[PDB]
């Protein structure tokens, strides 16, 4: 969408949240594919336990990705954009998309995996655009701020 929406507000999206899992690297196709597979395996196990995966709302902006409980609108994760190293869609499953965020708590890389019926590609592009705008602001401040 426009700069202004990402820059001045946020873009909301609905998704299902398969979870997050620790990875060894901040990027890479293999890394994310191994994570998505791990979390698909876990989800399948959980479904055999009678569990649904949770629905979440994502708010994407130049400041980050907020993961909300969609009914309460209560923030469950705030992934500051400058701690997100990589975002990708899954070339062999349209609905899957992911990002890698370096954890506040632990120094570990966490890959967050999600499912969107219609918007996976669009969501991934939106986070890419956020990266682009935030980096341009960063350069224009001569490397400073937050």
């Amino acid at each position: 969408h426009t700069p202004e929406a990402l820059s001045k507000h946020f873009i909301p999206y609905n998704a299902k949240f398969l979870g997050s899992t620790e990875v060894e690297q901040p990027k890479g196709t293999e890394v994310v594919r191994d994570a998505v597979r791990k979390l698909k395996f876990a989800r399948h196990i959980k479904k055999s336990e009678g569990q649904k995966i949770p629905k979440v709302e994502l708010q994407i902006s130049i400041y980050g990705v907020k993961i909300l409980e969609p009914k309460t609108k209560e923030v469950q994760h705030n992934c500051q954009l400058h701690r997100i190293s990589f975002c990708a869609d899954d070339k062999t499953d349209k609905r899957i998309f992911t990002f890698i965020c370096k954890d506040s708590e632990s120094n570990k890389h966490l890959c967050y995996v999600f499912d969107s019926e219609k918007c996976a590609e669009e969501i991934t592009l939106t986070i890419g655009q956020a990266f682009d705008l935030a980096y341009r602001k960063f350069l224009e401040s001569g490397g400073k701020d937050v």
Binding site: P26, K27, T29, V32, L81, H82, R83, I84, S85, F86, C87, A88, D89, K91, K102, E121, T124, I127, G128, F131, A134, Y135, F138, G143
Partner: peptide, 12 residues
């Protein structure tokens, strides 16, 4: 189709 965040490296 993936994107690296250029800003990341400077905040680590």
């Amino acid at each position: 189709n993936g994107y690296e965040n250029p800003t990341y490296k400077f905040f680590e």
